[PDB]
Amino acid sequence: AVIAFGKFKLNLGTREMFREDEPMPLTSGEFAVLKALVSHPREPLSRDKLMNLARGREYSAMERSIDVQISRLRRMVEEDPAHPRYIQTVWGLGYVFVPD
């Protein structure tokens, strides 16, 4: 129901997210990208696959370029974006959500 990783708790249904229980906002583009990643734990997703999975009934997949959304999301959930733990890169493939 609520995805939990690190100090985060994410509710895919309501789009509510918390950092150590303090409410944090997810723009449509961040949410669309985070949801795709989080709902496919350990499945590396190409940028194309991400873009396709991010599409919703609202303006989201077209908000920003995948890499930038990824960069933005890493700034929000990683202790060190340069060495991400949750939103990782799979060389020659794309990106992957690693749970825990």
From Swiss-Prot:
DNA-binding stretch(es), residue numbering of this chain: 1-99
Subcellular compartments: Cytoplasm
UniProt-reported outcome of changing R15C: In ompR20; no OmpF expression, OmpC abnormally expressed at high osmlolarity
Consequence of substituting V90C: Wild-type transcription activation, decreased DNA-binding, about 40% phosphorylation in vitro
Effect of R72A: Loss of transcription activation
Expression induction or repression: 1.8-fold induced by growth in 15% sucrose, no change upon growth at pH 5.6. Part of the ompR-envZ operon.
Effect of T89C: Loss of transcription activation, loss of DNA-binding, about 10% phosphorylation in vitro
Reported effect, W91 to A/C: Loss of transcription activation, loss of DNA-binding, about 20% phosphorylation in vitro
Domain of life per record: Bacteria
Modification after translation: Phosphorylated by EnvZ. Phosphorylation stimulates the DNA-binding ability of OmpR. Dephosphorylated by EnvZ in the presence of ATP.
Phenotype on disruption: Loss of expression of OmpC and OmpF under low and high osmolarity. Deletion of both ompR and envZ leads to loss of both OmpC and OmpF expression under 0% and 15% sucrose. Cells no longer reduce their internal pH in response to external acid stress.
Domain notes: Composed of an N-terminal response regulatory domain joined by a flexible linker to the C-terminal DNA-binding domain; the relative conformation of the 2 domains alters upon phosphorylation.
Additional free-text comment from the UniProt record: Cross talk between this and the Che and Ntr two-component systems can occur at least in vitro.
Protein task: Member of the two-component regulatory system EnvZ/OmpR involved in osmoregulation (particularly of genes ompF and ompC) as well as other genes. Plays a central role in both acid and osmotic stress responses. Binds AT-rich DNA. Binds to the promoter of both ompC and ompF; at low osmolarity it activates ompF transcription, while at high osmolarity it represses ompF and activates ompC transcription. Involved in acid stress response; this requires EnvZ but not OmpR phosphorylation. Phosphorylated by EnvZ; this stimulates OmpR's DNA-binding ability. Is also dephosphorylated by EnvZ.
Subunit structure: Monomer in solution. Up to 8 OmpR molecules bind to the ompF promoter; each 20 base pair (bp) region of the promoter binds 2 molecules of OmpR, which may only interact upon DNA-binding. Binds to direct repeats in the 20 bp DNA fragments. At pH 7.1 protein is monomeric, as the pH decreases to 6.5 and 6.1 about 70% is dimeric, which is poorly phosphorylated. DNA-binding ability increases at acidic pH.
Protein name: DNA-binding dual transcriptional regulator OmpR
Organism: Escherichia coli (strain K12)
Species lineage: Bacteria, Pseudomonadati, Pseudomonadota, Gammaproteobacteria, Enterobacterales
